[PDB]
Every structure is written in C-alpha cells, then in structure tokens.
Amino acid sequence: MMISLIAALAVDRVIGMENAMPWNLPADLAWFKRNTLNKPVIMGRHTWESIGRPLPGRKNIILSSQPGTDDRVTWVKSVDEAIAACGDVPEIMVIGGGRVYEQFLPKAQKLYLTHIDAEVEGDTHFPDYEPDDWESVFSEFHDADAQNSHSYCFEILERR
Numbered sequence: 001m002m003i004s005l006i007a008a009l010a011v012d013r014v015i016g017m018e019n020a021m022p023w024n025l026p027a028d029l030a031w032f033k034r035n036t037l038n039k040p041v042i043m044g045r046h047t048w049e050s051i052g053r054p055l056p057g058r059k060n061i062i063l064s065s066q067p068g069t070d071d072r073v074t075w076v077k078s079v080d081e082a083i084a085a086c087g088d089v090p091e092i093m094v095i096g097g098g099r100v101y102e103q104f105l106p107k108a109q110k111l112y113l114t115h116i117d118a119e120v121e122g123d124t125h126f127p128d129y130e131p132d133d134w135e136s137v138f139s140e141f142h143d144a145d146a147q148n149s150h151s152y153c154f155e156i157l158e159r160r
C-alpha cells in the first residue's frame with residue numbers, strides 16, 4: 001504494497017513556491033509525524049532540500065537522478081527503486097513534491113491531505129484527484145489560533 005501520499009494543500013491545490021510556504025502550522029506537522037512515523041518516506045530531491053535533515057524514526061528515501069550527498073538517508077534513481085528500497089511494509093508514505101506526487105498518485109491507495117485556507121500564489125500543485133476515484137473516510141476541521149497561522153482541515157481519502 002500500500003502506497004499513500006501525504007501533502008499540505010493551499011487553495012487551488014498549491015503545495016509549493018520558490019521559497020518555503022508562508023505559513024506556520026505546527027498542528028499539521030504533528031499530524032504528518034503521527035501518520036509517517038515508523039514508515040518509510042519517499043521524497044524528491046527538492047523536498048529533501050527543503051526539509052534540511054533526515055526525518056527521525058523513519059526510513060528516508062530520496063529520489064534523484066544524481067548521486068547521493070548524505071549517507072544518513074537512502075538514495076534512489078527511479079520510482080521502482082524507491083519502492084524496492086521500502087521492502088515489504090504495510091504502508092509506504094510519499095511526502096512530496098509535485099513531480100513525485102504526479103508519478104506515485106496512480107499507484108496510491110490512500111491520501112492524507114491537509115487543506116489549508118491560505119491563498120498563496122505558487123508554481124507547484126498537488127495533482128488532480130477526481131472524487132470518482134477517491135472516497136473521503138476522515139475529516140477534521142480546525143480554526144487558526146495562536147499557534148497555527150491558518151485554518152486547516154485534515155482529510156483521509158481511500159481509492160474507490
């Protein structure tokens with residue numbers, strides 16, 4: 001196997017811009033950690049560079065056409081190699097970015113989405129996912145507050 005995508009989405013499915021997203025959402029990061037801990041995480045090189053260090057308590061797998069540059073994580077050159085590096089686990093987590101999501105979404109059975117009520121002009125988007133193919137099985141809404149800069153709604157969808 002089961003492959004899942006986990007992503008934080010601004011308005012219009014924006015997930016990235018030139019620099020870090022202009023928001024502060026510790027609740028989202030706690031949700032991300034709770035749902036990825038003890039699972040392998042696959043990420044593209046740009047997402048790796050934006051996180052800046054290995055995610056603890058998870059097998060970190062970086063996709064890049066070029067040789068690796070950090071021995072604390074696993075480096076792979078193809079989608080199939082990334083999957084192979086995960087071994088036989090109950091669930092593989094794909095954590096970004098847009099180019100990686102595009103290639104893994106067809107193979108995915110589960111989406112963990114955080115919908116953030118932030119209007120951000122950004123060049124990178126989460127790929128189209130049709131409701132015909134994806135059934136919402138969990139939803140939890142939260143207002144912005146002293147710790148979280150925008151309102152956010154957690155959602156899990158499973159492939160119909």
Ligand SMILES: Nc1ccc(C(=O)N[C@@H](CCC(=O)O)C(=O)O)cc1
Nearest residue numbers: 026029030032033036050051055056
């Ligand atoms: N695109 C990002 C994804 C994850 C994180 C990150 O720092 N996550 C911590 C969570 C921080 C915490 O709640 O302690 C983790 O998963 O362990 C940062 C950027």
Ligand SMILES: Nc1ccnc(N)n1
Nearest residue numbers: 006007008032095114
């Ligand atoms: N991939 C990511 C990064 C941050 N937050 C969530 N929910 N997903």
